[PDB]
RNA sequence: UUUACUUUGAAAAAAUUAGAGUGUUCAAAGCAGGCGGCUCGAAUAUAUUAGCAUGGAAUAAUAGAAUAGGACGU
RNA sequence: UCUGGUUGAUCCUGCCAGUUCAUAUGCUUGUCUCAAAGAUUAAGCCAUGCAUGUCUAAGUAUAAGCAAUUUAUACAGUGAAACUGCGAAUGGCUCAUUAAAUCAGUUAUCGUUUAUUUGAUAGUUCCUUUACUACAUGGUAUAACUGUGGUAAUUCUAGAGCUAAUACAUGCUAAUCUCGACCCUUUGGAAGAGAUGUAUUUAUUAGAAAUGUCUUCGGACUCUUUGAUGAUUCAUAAUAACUUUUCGAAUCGCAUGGCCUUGUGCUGGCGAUGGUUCAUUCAAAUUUCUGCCCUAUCAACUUUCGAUGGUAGGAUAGUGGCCUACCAUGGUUUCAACGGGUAACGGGGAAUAAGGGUUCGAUUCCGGAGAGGGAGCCUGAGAAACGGCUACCA
């Protein structure tokens, strides 16, 4: 959890050393809404992720999309592939098209290449990421 | 000359984009204020709208908080000991947010002695590392303010796991 | 998860409201009855049966003078597809439930609405959908036809002077090829 | 552009004003005010194109600078002042009181009201929130902030505002069976009773409305305005009673 | 079961297009109110795709602890 | 697309001959209504004139201005000049650049600024030099103006002397609310115990079987005590400090009412302009999904000099590789990436057609961009402005 040059912490969550009520450091979390269950690995985890939808400073609002994970080779973000049929009226026929969406995945989730994820829209996280994994399947 | 537009960058595919338009004032940046320890030098900046920012060009004091004791005292900043982004900021003693600095322990020591009557006993007990620092005369603190934005060099005294982490990193 | 358990709360609301002053009754009853009928939009058959029993009990508590309001509310909320079949199944259930409480000529005011539902579900488009072999569904409202029983309930209550309301759609049907 | 626009082409003007296309090149651009640009009737359009008391803009200015026109009980001298839905316009010299309500065509109707009805208006609650020092307040559809509201008042409810004091006299909850007026969309101007509010989290809520002729239609919740209980509105309604 | 598909409903500025009324002297046009309550008057419509709500029994994909099994040890 | 020929007479396949719009141009051209006006891919170059200023009773007049007067006693009618304020960021023009860019429809801001409009909103009583302006502070100050001047020349200005403010800069003046013993039993009195703005930065905290007794039959006796969203570290509140630190009316017109212990005493009407924060409105910046012509004889591209992502900081109004430091090695692509061409601004639309299609859209509305070419800025709520400024190229 502390593999960075700076100390990782949830901002403004204070763990009082003088009191020492509980061994576990105080952990803030929220439920993201829209019927998405907050996983217990987020509630009882130790990870620090400012871009997590359950324990970071990001909210889910906007479009809710679904896709298939096609890449997981970068740290805490994946690439999903969304496929659709585009209609050509001249030939009165369809053609397969796709797009790649880069998504942020919180370390409360485990995703492999091939599984289906539901992602929710959040504020721009990076140059290309505007979505956050809210459910894996 | 600083701009924050994203049009000058390459597309996510790697394509080189062409110039859509000339640079706009609503997407500008300004020169950094490399705040340094010394006599207070602050100049205002007129920002978007009528709003104003404060540029700390130089600063040697700050309001630092002892969170366990729930207090704040104004204190002199001795120097920057560690910075997690760039070591040249430590080399040049540049004050920014998240910098680890050393502060004079005197006002906190005076408050502690006045409040607990000690140099009751259970409440007076504090961490061993913080007390060792008090013996040294300087306390490790983290700057929580943005000096180049608000003109203030506020911060707090390192304690617990954060203090252990930064003692290791030093 | 708890919707079926809470539906009888609507029956409690009708009782306390009916004790209020008449102006308050007119101000609270339409909201309560309307809200129940919207749950019939649900795609859950078990929930739709839970709604149906609460509507039956409320119908006994109320009189036949409120029957016209309920039926017109029911026709407004159920309009397309399987909802048409739910409408006639629920209309019969209310009539079946109110069989003891109903007095002679209580259904005269709502006689015209009932026969339109009855005829549409025997000879109308709804009736054909019940007889269609291509129509594979497990919904009981649609596989079951209660129009015949509703016709018997109606004929037991209608005043003989209004009995031409039943015969007129029959005559119109008989003029066309059958 | 490099800043806010100050003109309005006649073709780009709100259609419901019924401006002649050949009269000129520009329409009166409503000024900032209680109502949005597209949802407002500037006083010039009302005084000249609806009431015909003025033959042109200069006579509208002459009328306004005599302080003859009151909007919600206060004198307005701005020619493009944006009067809107549920606004009361008073002309004392003519002994006239008007309430701005759309007709079934979707256009603001010239609806004359009595001096007793001219004393209040209806405001849809757009927001309920705590202000500084923990004082609650309600924001209505016409931009009125009203402090110390009744705790039962919620968003989408309607409040009855006394114009002389600007205080809430009564309120109506948004609930099934309430009488509602459609203030947007293609059903703008129709009146009916709420049947069901279809809720979608993170999306737009929808309301089913049944008219007196038993016709049903669906509208977004943003376009719905509670005006009373069925069979008893709180305001006099225009001719047609919002039918068809 | 889900999707595709299909039905209905919102949405898709105005002008332009189609359509209704109206002796601009006719016409191209422009235009919304008349009589002293009259049940009088543009009634209006139009848009492939994408997103939103909604009714569907076929068709094409997609799913099932579907019609499964029951012997040993110290 | 049809018509007539090629045979002694037919059918099929071929040959021959005839069969609106756009540009340029020729001749003619009386009357009514109506209406437009591009083009050398030359977004090539421009003489001259005009196209942006603005004053109410209500910011500032001893103009040595004009005119009045019961012929003036601080001023007072009207008012050039100048200061102050606001606007000049709208409008109008053009289509050069631009190929997921603009644009169209559809989203988001729980990711930010917003002059103005509309609605709300700020008694902090006291706290030692009271050695005390609030019946009201300064030049830490000037323009116009007067006068002395430089230059061939410009909406060039220097030295000297004056004088205002809603300019600039300073700075003040016996309250209210909780309980309340005691009396008294209400229209109560009050010994006393307590409490006390905003703005800025940070840290911390909150924000979740009374089913009885009496009573006059009413009612009283004990307890409750934030709200919202699908969702928040939200609204709001509290504690401790902090600040080259804010604000908390030294402003203006009209008028002369009310109390008296008769003092130019106290009080007091209808307005203007300002001012803190919130809301609203006019907006702005970003933003989600889908959708573009030709080219594969362009198959790999991006990443050394940010390309994809992580952590932290800096900058921004604010999210974000937007930039920096340190880390990983990612990102796109035969479902056509990347590169090339475009006589490529996009759309609403126009033409044609029986339908499918195909072409046109600089051009009355909307959106974008530009002001000879690159680049950078001041002021301001708002401009990377060009009928604003600074450089370089021509
Ligand atoms: Mg412009
Ligand atoms: Mg609608
Ligand atoms: Mg003649
Ligand atoms: Mg003024
Ligand atoms: Mg290209
Ligand atoms: Mg103004
Ligand atoms: Mg205001
Ligand atoms: Mg907060
Ligand atoms: Mg950062
Ligand atoms: Mg770098
Ligand atoms: Mg071009
Ligand atoms: Mg244009
Ligand atoms: Mg420009
Ligand atoms: Mg030129
Ligand atoms: Mg300005
Ligand atoms: Mg420029
Ligand atoms: Mg020019
Ligand atoms: Mg210009």
Swiss-Prot record, chain A:
Keywords of the record, alphabetical order, are: Acetylation, Cytoplasm, Isopeptide bond, Ribonucleoprotein, Ribosomal protein, RNA-binding, rRNA-binding, Ubl conjugation
Q: Which superkingdom does the taxonomy of this entry point to?
A: Eukaryota
> Where is it mostly found?
cytoplasm
State where the protein is found: Cytoplasm
The record lists the lineage as:
Eukaryota, Fungi, Dikarya, Ascomycota, Saccharomycotina
Protein name as annotated: Small ribosomal subunit protein uS17A
Q: How is it modified after translation?
A: N-terminally acetylated by acetyltransferase NatA.
Note in the entry? There are 2 genes for uS17 in yeast.
| GO annotation, cellular component aspect | 90S preribosome; cytosol; cytosolic small ribosomal subunit
Which PROSITE patterns does the annotation name?
RIBOSOMAL_S17 (PS00056)
- Job of this protein: Component of the ribosome, a large ribonucleoprotein complex responsible for the synthesis of proteins in the cell. The small ribosomal subunit (SSU) binds messenger RNAs (mRNAs) and translates the encoded message by selecting cognate aminoacyl-transfer RNA (tRNA) molecules. The large subunit (LSU) contains the ribosomal catalytic site termed the peptidyl transferase center (PTC), which catalyzes the formation of peptide bonds, thereby polymerizing the amino acids delivered by tRNAs into a polypeptide chain.
Instruction: Note whether Transcription regulation occurs among the keywords.
Output: no
> Renumbered to this chain, where is the cross-link Glycyl lysine isopeptide (Lys-Gly) (interchain with G-Cter in ubiquitin)?
9, 40, 50-51, 73, 90, 99, 127, 135
Q: Which family does it belong to?
A: Belongs to the universal ribosomal protein uS17 family.
Entry coiled-coil feature ranges: none
GO molecular function terms noted in the UniProt entry = rRNA binding; structural constituent of ribosome
GO BP of this protein: maturation of SSU-rRNA from tricistronic rRNA transcript (SSU-rRNA, 5.8S rRNA, LSU-rRNA); ribosomal small subunit assembly; translation
UniProtKB/Swiss-Prot annotation, chain B:
Q: Residues where Phosphoserine occurs?
A: 65, 68, 72, 85, 128-129, 132, 135
What UniProt keywords apply to this chain's record, in alphabetical order? Cytoplasm, Phosphoprotein, Ribonucleoprotein, Ribosomal protein
Localization recorded for this chain is: Cytoplasm
Per its record, what are the GO molecular function terms? structural constituent of ribosome
Name a single GO biological process.
Answer: translation
Q: What positions are modified (Phosphothreonine)? A: 61, 106
Do the record's keywords include Ribosomal protein?
Answer: yes
User: What Pfam families does this protein map onto?
Assistant: Ribosomal_S8e
What InterPro entries does UniProt report for this protein, alphabetically? Ribosomal_eS8 (IPR001047), Ribosomal_eS8_CS (IPR018283), Ribosomal_protein_eS8_euk (IPR042563), Ribosomal_Se8/biogenesis_NSA2 (IPR022309)
Task: Give the matching CDD domains.
Answer: Ribosomal_S8e_like
Question: What cellular-component terms does GO give this entry?
Answer: 90S preribosome; cytosol; cytosolic small ribosomal subunit
Location of region: Disordered = 1-30
Question: Which family, according to the similarity comment?
Answer: Belongs to the eukaryotic ribosomal protein eS8 family.
Any further remark recorded for this protein: Present with 15900 molecules/cell in log phase SD medium. There are 2 genes for eS8 in yeast.
Function comment: Component of the ribosome, a large ribonucleoprotein complex responsible for the synthesis of proteins in the cell. The small ribosomal subunit (SSU) binds messenger RNAs (mRNAs) and translates the encoded message by selecting cognate aminoacyl-transfer RNA (tRNA) molecules. The large subunit (LSU) contains the ribosomal catalytic site termed the peptidyl transferase center (PTC), which catalyzes the formation of peptide bonds, thereby polymerizing the amino acids delivered by tRNAs into a polypeptide chain.
What NCBIfam families has UniProt attached to this entry? eS8 (TIGR00307)
Q: What is this protein called?
A: Small ribosomal subunit protein eS8A
Q: From which organism does this entry originate?
A: Saccharomyces cerevisiae (strain ATCC 204508 / S288c) (Baker's yeast)
Protein encoded by which gene: RPS8A
From Swiss-Prot, chain C:
Compartments it resides in: Cytoplasm; Nucleus, Nucleolus
Q: Where are the HEAT repeats?
A: 27-64
Q: What does the protein in this record do?
A: Involved in nucleolar processing of pre-18S ribosomal RNA and ribosome assembly.
**Subunit-level organization:** Interacts with snoRNA U3. Interacts with MPP10. Component of the ribosomal small subunit (SSU) processome composed of at least 40 protein subunits and snoRNA U3.
What is the similarity comment for this entry? Belongs to the UTP20 family.
For this entry, the protein name equals U3 small nucleolar RNA-associated protein 20
Q: Which gene encodes it?
A: UTP20
Swiss-Prot record, chain D:
Q: Does the keyword Transmembrane apply?
A: no
Q: Which residues does the UniProt record annotate as the domain S4 RNA-binding? A: 41-104
Q: Where is this cross-link: Glycyl lysine isopeptide (Lys-Gly) (interchain with G-Cter in ubiquitin)?
A: 61, 133, 160, 167, 173, 178, 210, 232
What compartments host this protein? Cytoplasm
- Where Phosphothreonine occurs along the chain? 114
User: Which key words tag this protein in UniProt?
Assistant: Cytoplasm, Isopeptide bond, Phosphoprotein, Ribonucleoprotein, Ribosomal protein, RNA-binding, rRNA-binding, Ubl conjugation
Q: Which GO terms describe its biological process?
A: cytoplasmic translation; translation
Determine if Nucleotide-binding is one of this entry's keywords: no
Name positions with the PTM Phosphoserine.
31
SMART domains assigned to the protein according to its UniProt record, in alphabetical order: S4 (SM00363)
Q: Please provide one cellular component term from the Gene Ontology annotations of this protein.
A: cytosol
Q: Which residues cross the membrane?
A: none
Q: Which GO terms describe its molecular function?
A: RNA binding; rRNA binding; structural constituent of ribosome
Q: What does the further note read?
A: Present with 573 molecules/cell in log phase SD medium. There are 2 genes for eS4 in yeast.
Subunit structure, as described in the record = Component of the small ribosomal subunit (SSU). Mature yeast ribosomes consist of a small (40S) and a large (60S) subunit. The 40S small subunit contains 1 molecule of ribosomal RNA (18S rRNA) and 33 different proteins (encoded by 57 genes). The large 60S subunit contains 3 rRNA molecules (25S, 5.8S and 5S rRNA) and 46 different proteins (encoded by 81 genes).
Family statement drawn from the similarity comment of this UniProt entry: Belongs to the eukaryotic ribosomal protein eS4 family.
Q: What is this protein called?
A: Small ribosomal subunit protein eS4A
Q: Which organism is it from?
A: Saccharomyces cerevisiae (strain ATCC 204508 / S288c) (Baker's yeast)
The gene is RPS4A
